[PDB]
Amino acid sequence: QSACTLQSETHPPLTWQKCSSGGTCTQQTGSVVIDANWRWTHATNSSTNCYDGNTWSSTLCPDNETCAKNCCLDGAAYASTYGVTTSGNSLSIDFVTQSAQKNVGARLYLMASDTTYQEFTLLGNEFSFDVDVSQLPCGLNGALYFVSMDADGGVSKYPTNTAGAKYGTGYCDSQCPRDLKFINGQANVEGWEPSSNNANTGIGGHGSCCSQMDIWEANSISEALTPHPCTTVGQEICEGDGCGGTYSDNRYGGTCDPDGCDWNPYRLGNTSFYGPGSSFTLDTTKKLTVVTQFETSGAINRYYVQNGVTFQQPNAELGSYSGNELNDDYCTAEEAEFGGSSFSDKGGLTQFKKATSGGMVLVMSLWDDYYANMLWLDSTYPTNETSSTPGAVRGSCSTSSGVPAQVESQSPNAKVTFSNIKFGPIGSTGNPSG
Amino acid sequence: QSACTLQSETHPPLTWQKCSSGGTCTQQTGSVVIDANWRWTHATNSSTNCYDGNTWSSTLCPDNETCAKNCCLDGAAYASTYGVTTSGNSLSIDFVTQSAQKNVGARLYLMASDTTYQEFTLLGNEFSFDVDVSQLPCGLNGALYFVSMDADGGVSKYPTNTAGAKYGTGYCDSQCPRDLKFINGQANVEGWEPSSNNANTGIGGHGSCCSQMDIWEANSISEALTPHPCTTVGQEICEGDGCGGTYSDNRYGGTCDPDGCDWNPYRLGNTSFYGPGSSFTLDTTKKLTVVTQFETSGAINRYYVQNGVTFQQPNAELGSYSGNELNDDYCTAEEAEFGGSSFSDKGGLTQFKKATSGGMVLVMSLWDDYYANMLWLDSTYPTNETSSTPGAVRGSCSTSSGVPAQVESQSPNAKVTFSNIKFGPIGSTGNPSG
Ligand SMILES: O[C@@H]1[C@@H](O)[C@H](O[C@@H]2CO[C@@H](O[C@@H]3CO[C@@H](O)[C@H](O)[C@H]3O)[C@H](O)[C@H]2O)OC[C@H]1O
Ligand SMILES: O[C@@H]1[C@@H](O)[C@H](O[C@@H]2CO[C@@H](O[C@@H]3CO[C@@H](O)[C@H](O)[C@H]3O)[C@H](O)[C@H]2O)OC[C@H]1O
Ligand SMILES: *[C@@H]1O[C@H](CO)[C@@H](O)[C@H](O)[C@H]1NC(C)=O
Ligand SMILES: *[C@@H]1O[C@H](CO)[C@@H](O)[C@H](O)[C@H]1NC(C)=O
Ligand SMILES: [Co+2]
Ligand SMILES: [Co+2]
Ligand SMILES: [Co+2]
């Protein structure tokens, strides 16, 4: 796609701290951009939609190439259309925003300049942020994560994409998402099927795959940390059901691991660690700090701070594994006890290390789940299982929770706030901000 | 040996904090006891010495069993004879103390009760302490470490030892030390050879071996962190040169690894990290905090705090190893690049994990080195090597430094102070003391 300017594009600014081993931190100035899928897509020569509801224009978009030639992405009114605001080092995303139309959530990338994404090399480093999840009920996911995207959003590889990072192109993740309207500078109209339950989305004949570090997927009830390896580290197109992932016939039939080696303290047995109010170790009615450390062995370490009190990731015992570090032994034990072979099939933490050794882009989002109602995060899943099935219970939410139309109607004012992002060598981010 | 009471034994009290995963710490009350080798050893029935200078009484001690039957250990005047004082959570050890006789240094164990040692299980936990090394010049070693000693100092296994932990019996370490005057409730007079350069010590026909975690061996110039595995985890007697260790003919001819997998930031190339004054990351003229974390994989992590600024162990690159965690990959790379096979021969971190999974006793000491002048810690070693030999340079001290008689004469007022000991789950010890 190209870019149009019927609506101006002003990326909300966002600062973050880069820390060094010598003990100081210095402020960096970036901004955030909304993903292309949230944008208005129209003809280059007029205001006629190329996509509306969950249908493509059959005249403007008769095939993937003609569509990309005819169509452009336009600018975003971040606050009034999308409920996205920033203030200094803080970012807020509202759940439902009513303007001329209803918008649900957002997916945002941290930028280095108005036309390029910021890349972070996670290996050997740590990432710290503060989050307020108090206004996230069952069925919602305020997510902070990394994906192996190109810094230009794909322009250099796909010259029919001229919109680029400035317009939030080039997304990929470990679900090999096929809901993307543009992949590799083409549209995704070929093979398009509208969603049976979502007026605004569908699934096309192509998907976009890459490695994904899910640092934080959470609401006020449950939180999870999950690396997802792919056999191709960076962004790569996939074809139809060969994509695998959530929306293909076989989620395991592609190049990425859609399940991941997940660590949810509640799922692992500590049902007192994280939740709303003073009965939990971390009180999710209050802001908390989350620090994630990527040691060079490829293992991941985690600690939290709330009201000046520090807590390592809680210990878990699973099969022959015992500890609080997300390492090979944990992931192997998890597969043995909870089931599955996707993480190990895709190369486990060794393959994942190839992603964290390279550059990844920071993503912050808020979403509800039109496939599985977020039950995999915060409820019992699958819903016919009981607590006697190892790993079935992931949180205290009812198996009836998270119906998107219901939570959109009942909780439109839900929101997530991410703040005080700090990045640098392991051990450096607790030092004073500069 | 038995215990005598011509001199009373009052263990200086010492408090420390036990922290929990839930974020609080509570004070514990213990005390310290001086090792048996520093004590007066005399006939049970009189004040006649069984040992004097570096010679045993040939009449009282004609053999190991008769000696133990005839002889007892007596009490210690901690401050006036040994230069050992405590105040709350702080312990100070002076280098040379002149009373009726000259005393050099001390080795002390933390007690649980007046008759038993405190045991710590390191695996899954972390140990934090503050240290002032400002008054430790080249050639000195203020050491804080753990060894796999019996809580009773050997009494249950060796009933001819009735003095016990109360009198500092039962020492062992990864050098399989043969300088001990009593091992396994026997004397060590058989095979005794006086030291050629130390008026107060010698080497006997038996040694005492066990696993050793050298958390801290340091002065104002250099510091090292070193696990030492043994093929028998806990305390075990050894015979003559079959002991291996520093003072046997072949240091590698026994059951312990006397070299260890050492991590000295200066040796590894960072010559700016630790030293006296503002030109170093950690200024050794000032108190610093040292935290050591024993993750369940068997790897060891380390960070430091000084003036509220936190520093992970500095990164090192050695062969194919890169990082700051002391793990299998580091220890293997160290052997490949610096030389040696002792650590891996004795089972490496896997064997070492058996020690940290069990109980170990806390040791604090101050010593000078009558074998190698502490050059292995703070100078170039061996002394004919140059900086072009990988790992030869371990600190900035002259290869002429550390002659015991010289440093004892020039620096008698040297001292080390250890304080604010805190122990608990990984991530817990930075929380407020209780
Ligand atoms: O025509 C434009 C609309 O299409 C646009 O609607 C937004 C489309 O994206 C929606 O978010 C989806 C949520 O799930 C992700 O997986 C999808 O990729 C996203 O597309 C968003 O809720 C809609 O508001 O709004 C502007 C119109 O001009
Ligand atoms: O007779 C008693 C003396 O023997 C005693 O002297 C102390 C003996 O221990 C000395 O410390 C040695 C240092 O190196 C360690 O490896 C040794 O095991 C220790 O023995 C200490 O410096 C001497 O003061 O003092 C009291 C006398 O009654
Ligand atoms: C030494 O370590 C400190 C602390 O990590 C680091 O900031 C510095 O760059 C290192 N210097 C060298 C020469 O390795
Ligand atoms: C949950 O984790 C916290 C923090 O480590 C710990 O203090 C608590 O004992 C754990 N509870 C359970 C049930 O595992
Ligand atoms: Co195709
Ligand atoms: Co013997
Ligand atoms: Co580790």
mmCIF file of C-alpha atoms in Angstrom, chain A residues 200-375:
data_model
loop_
_atom_site.group_PDB
_atom_site.id
_atom_site.type_symbol
_atom_site.label_atom_id
_atom_site.label_comp_id
_atom_site.label_asym_id
_atom_site.label_seq_id
_atom_site.Cartn_x
_atom_site.Cartn_y
_atom_site.Cartn_z
ATOM 1 C CA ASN A 200 -14.557 -5.596 11.415
ATOM 2 C CA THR A 201 -12.214 -8.522 10.651
ATOM 3 C CA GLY A 202 -11.523 -11.534 8.488
ATOM 4 C CA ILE A 203 -8.871 -14.056 7.426
ATOM 5 C CA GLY A 204 -6.993 -13.952 4.098
ATOM 6 C CA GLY A 205 -4.925 -16.335 2.001
ATOM 7 C CA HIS A 206 -1.581 -15.082 3.393
ATOM 8 C CA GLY A 207 -0.182 -14.732 6.925
ATOM 9 C CA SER A 208 2.872 -13.006 8.390
ATOM 10 C CA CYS A 209 5.186 -15.040 10.655
ATOM 11 C CA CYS A 210 8.037 -14.205 13.018
ATOM 12 C CA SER A 211 9.544 -14.849 16.435
ATOM 13 C CA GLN A 212 7.746 -13.303 19.432
ATOM 14 C CA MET A 213 8.740 -12.528 23.013
ATOM 15 C CA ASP A 214 5.510 -12.136 25.015
ATOM 16 C CA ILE A 215 6.919 -10.279 27.986
ATOM 17 C CA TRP A 216 3.483 -9.444 29.363
ATOM 18 C CA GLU A 217 -0.017 -10.635 28.556
ATOM 19 C CA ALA A 218 -2.234 -9.777 31.430
ATOM 20 C CA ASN A 219 -5.300 -8.364 33.064
ATOM 21 C CA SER A 220 -6.212 -7.795 36.731
ATOM 22 C CA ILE A 221 -6.694 -11.592 37.212
ATOM 23 C CA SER A 222 -3.844 -13.397 35.350
ATOM 24 C CA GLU A 223 -0.489 -12.671 33.701
ATOM 25 C CA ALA A 224 1.796 -14.747 31.485
ATOM 26 C CA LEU A 225 5.391 -14.590 30.194
ATOM 27 C CA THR A 226 5.907 -16.540 26.945
ATOM 28 C CA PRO A 227 8.720 -16.966 24.386
ATOM 29 C CA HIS A 228 7.570 -18.257 20.951
ATOM 30 C CA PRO A 229 10.247 -19.587 18.516
ATOM 31 C CA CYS A 230 9.852 -19.895 14.720
ATOM 32 C CA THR A 231 12.002 -21.890 12.265
ATOM 33 C CA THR A 232 12.517 -18.636 10.352
ATOM 34 C CA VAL A 233 13.545 -15.985 12.889
ATOM 35 C CA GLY A 234 12.308 -12.830 11.116
ATOM 36 C CA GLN A 235 9.334 -11.721 9.082
ATOM 37 C CA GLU A 236 8.162 -14.252 6.487
ATOM 38 C CA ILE A 237 4.918 -14.650 4.495
ATOM 39 C CA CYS A 238 2.982 -17.931 4.768
ATOM 40 C CA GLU A 239 0.329 -19.498 2.542
ATOM 41 C CA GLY A 240 -3.159 -20.365 3.740
ATOM 42 C CA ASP A 241 -3.461 -23.236 6.206
ATOM 43 C CA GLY A 242 0.278 -23.820 5.798
ATOM 44 C CA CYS A 243 0.484 -20.779 8.073
ATOM 45 C CA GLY A 244 -0.594 -22.697 11.164
ATOM 46 C CA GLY A 245 -1.542 -20.440 14.080
ATOM 47 C CA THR A 246 -4.846 -19.645 15.773
ATOM 48 C CA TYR A 247 -6.911 -19.149 12.605
ATOM 49 C CA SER A 248 -5.654 -21.972 10.417
ATOM 50 C CA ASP A 249 -7.210 -25.443 10.362
ATOM 51 C CA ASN A 250 -4.147 -26.890 12.116
ATOM 52 C CA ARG A 251 -2.473 -24.465 14.513
ATOM 53 C CA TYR A 252 0.701 -26.620 14.369
ATOM 54 C CA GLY A 253 1.016 -26.844 10.580
ATOM 55 C CA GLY A 254 3.413 -23.944 10.039
ATOM 56 C CA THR A 255 6.809 -22.452 10.876
ATOM 57 C CA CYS A 256 5.987 -20.789 14.251
ATOM 58 C CA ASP A 257 5.094 -22.061 17.687
ATOM 59 C CA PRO A 258 1.673 -20.559 18.535
ATOM 60 C CA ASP A 259 1.635 -22.032 22.045
ATOM 61 C CA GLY A 260 5.034 -21.028 23.428
ATOM 62 C CA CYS A 261 6.758 -21.933 26.661
ATOM 63 C CA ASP A 262 4.383 -19.993 28.893
ATOM 64 C CA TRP A 263 4.899 -19.087 32.517
ATOM 65 C CA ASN A 264 1.682 -18.053 34.333
ATOM 66 C CA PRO A 265 2.221 -18.226 38.120
ATOM 67 C CA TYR A 266 -1.472 -19.121 38.686
ATOM 68 C CA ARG A 267 -1.338 -21.936 36.081
ATOM 69 C CA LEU A 268 1.757 -23.300 37.812
ATOM 70 C CA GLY A 269 -0.057 -23.464 41.181
ATOM 71 C CA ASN A 270 0.508 -20.162 42.938
ATOM 72 C CA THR A 271 -3.011 -18.822 43.072
ATOM 73 C CA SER A 272 -2.110 -16.194 45.709
ATOM 74 C CA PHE A 273 0.623 -14.323 43.827
ATOM 75 C CA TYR A 274 -1.197 -11.910 41.532
ATOM 76 C CA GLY A 275 -4.720 -10.556 41.782
ATOM 77 C CA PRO A 276 -6.932 -7.682 42.948
ATOM 78 C CA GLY A 277 -6.586 -6.510 46.564
ATOM 79 C CA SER A 278 -4.515 -7.146 49.644
ATOM 80 C CA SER A 279 -5.003 -10.941 49.677
ATOM 81 C CA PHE A 280 -2.410 -11.281 46.852
ATOM 82 C CA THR A 281 1.358 -10.839 46.876
ATOM 83 C CA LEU A 282 1.028 -8.329 44.018
ATOM 84 C CA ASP A 283 -2.129 -6.196 44.286
ATOM 85 C CA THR A 284 -3.435 -5.583 40.774
ATOM 86 C CA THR A 285 -5.538 -2.613 41.863
ATOM 87 C CA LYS A 286 -2.201 -0.760 42.137
ATOM 88 C CA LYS A 287 0.619 0.011 39.656
ATOM 89 C CA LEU A 288 3.437 -2.550 39.616
ATOM 90 C CA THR A 289 6.912 -2.791 38.092
ATOM 91 C CA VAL A 290 7.843 -5.806 35.932
ATOM 92 C CA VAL A 291 11.480 -6.587 35.058
ATOM 93 C CA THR A 292 12.527 -9.260 32.556
ATOM 94 C CA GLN A 293 16.164 -10.317 32.093
ATOM 95 C CA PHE A 294 17.554 -12.208 29.124
ATOM 96 C CA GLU A 295 20.695 -13.988 30.258
ATOM 97 C CA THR A 296 23.104 -15.193 27.544
ATOM 98 C CA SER A 297 22.377 -18.864 28.227
ATOM 99 C CA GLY A 298 18.947 -18.184 26.602
ATOM 100 C CA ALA A 299 17.041 -18.514 29.906
ATOM 101 C CA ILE A 300 14.691 -15.770 31.101
ATOM 102 C CA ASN A 301 14.564 -14.297 34.612
ATOM 103 C CA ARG A 302 11.813 -12.176 36.127
ATOM 104 C CA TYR A 303 11.201 -10.054 39.180
ATOM 105 C CA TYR A 304 8.532 -7.546 40.244
ATOM 106 C CA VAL A 305 8.507 -4.458 42.475
ATOM 107 C CA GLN A 306 5.440 -2.952 44.168
ATOM 108 C CA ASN A 307 5.596 -0.276 46.887
ATOM 109 C CA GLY A 308 9.373 -0.736 47.082
ATOM 110 C CA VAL A 309 9.092 -4.477 47.869
ATOM 111 C CA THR A 310 10.833 -6.855 45.448
ATOM 112 C CA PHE A 311 9.615 -10.351 44.488
ATOM 113 C CA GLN A 312 11.362 -12.816 42.159
ATOM 114 C CA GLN A 313 9.090 -14.841 39.849
ATOM 115 C CA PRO A 314 7.527 -17.381 42.294
ATOM 116 C CA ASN A 315 9.062 -20.858 42.486
ATOM 117 C CA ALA A 316 7.317 -23.646 40.613
ATOM 118 C CA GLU A 317 7.704 -27.408 40.726
ATOM 119 C CA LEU A 318 6.649 -29.346 37.659
ATOM 120 C CA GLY A 319 7.814 -32.897 36.982
ATOM 121 C CA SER A 320 11.574 -32.881 37.645
ATOM 122 C CA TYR A 321 11.791 -29.106 37.255
ATOM 123 C CA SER A 322 12.079 -26.876 40.318
ATOM 124 C CA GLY A 323 12.880 -23.132 40.353
ATOM 125 C CA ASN A 324 11.860 -19.713 39.022
ATOM 126 C CA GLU A 325 13.983 -19.343 35.914
ATOM 127 C CA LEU A 326 12.327 -19.964 32.530
ATOM 128 C CA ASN A 327 14.939 -22.325 31.057
ATOM 129 C CA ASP A 328 15.213 -25.500 28.909
ATOM 130 C CA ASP A 329 14.403 -27.672 31.912
ATOM 131 C CA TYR A 330 11.204 -25.739 32.649
ATOM 132 C CA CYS A 331 9.983 -25.817 29.036
ATOM 133 C CA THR A 332 10.717 -29.547 28.683
ATOM 134 C CA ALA A 333 8.974 -30.338 31.968
ATOM 135 C CA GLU A 334 5.988 -28.205 30.927
ATOM 136 C CA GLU A 335 5.525 -30.198 27.730
ATOM 137 C CA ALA A 336 5.870 -33.470 29.665
ATOM 138 C CA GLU A 337 3.307 -32.481 32.332
ATOM 139 C CA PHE A 338 0.793 -30.217 30.538
ATOM 140 C CA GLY A 339 1.229 -31.787 27.054
ATOM 141 C CA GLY A 340 2.279 -30.587 23.616
ATOM 142 C CA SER A 341 5.384 -30.557 21.435
ATOM 143 C CA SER A 342 5.123 -27.231 19.543
ATOM 144 C CA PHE A 343 7.774 -25.279 21.514
ATOM 145 C CA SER A 344 10.344 -28.084 21.266
ATOM 146 C CA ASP A 345 9.415 -28.874 17.637
ATOM 147 C CA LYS A 346 10.321 -25.272 16.732
ATOM 148 C CA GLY A 347 13.695 -25.452 18.522
ATOM 149 C CA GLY A 348 12.878 -24.244 22.033
ATOM 150 C CA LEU A 349 15.001 -21.611 23.769
ATOM 151 C CA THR A 350 17.999 -22.309 21.527
ATOM 152 C CA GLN A 351 16.019 -21.220 18.456
ATOM 153 C CA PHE A 352 14.460 -18.437 20.438
ATOM 154 C CA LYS A 353 17.926 -17.116 21.329
ATOM 155 C CA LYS A 354 18.411 -16.329 17.632
ATOM 156 C CA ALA A 355 15.565 -13.823 17.860
ATOM 157 C CA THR A 356 16.762 -12.126 21.066
ATOM 158 C CA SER A 357 20.332 -11.987 19.655
ATOM 159 C CA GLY A 358 18.954 -9.870 16.802
ATOM 160 C CA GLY A 359 16.727 -6.800 16.762
ATOM 161 C CA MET A 360 13.086 -6.873 17.804
ATOM 162 C CA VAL A 361 10.380 -4.216 17.816
ATOM 163 C CA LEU A 362 8.408 -3.222 20.965
ATOM 164 C CA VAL A 363 4.614 -3.675 20.749
ATOM 165 C CA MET A 364 1.956 -2.472 23.213
ATOM 166 C CA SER A 365 -1.641 -3.467 22.700
ATOM 167 C CA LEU A 366 -5.063 -3.924 24.213
ATOM 168 C CA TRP A 367 -7.382 -6.598 22.845
ATOM 169 C CA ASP A 368 -10.250 -9.006 23.439
ATOM 170 C CA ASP A 369 -10.275 -12.496 22.004
ATOM 171 C CA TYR A 370 -12.724 -13.418 19.254
ATOM 172 C CA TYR A 371 -11.346 -16.975 19.056
ATOM 173 C CA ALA A 372 -11.209 -18.191 22.689
ATOM 174 C CA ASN A 373 -12.490 -15.348 24.931
ATOM 175 C CA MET A 374 -9.097 -15.064 26.690
ATOM 176 C CA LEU A 375 -9.881 -18.260 28.638
#
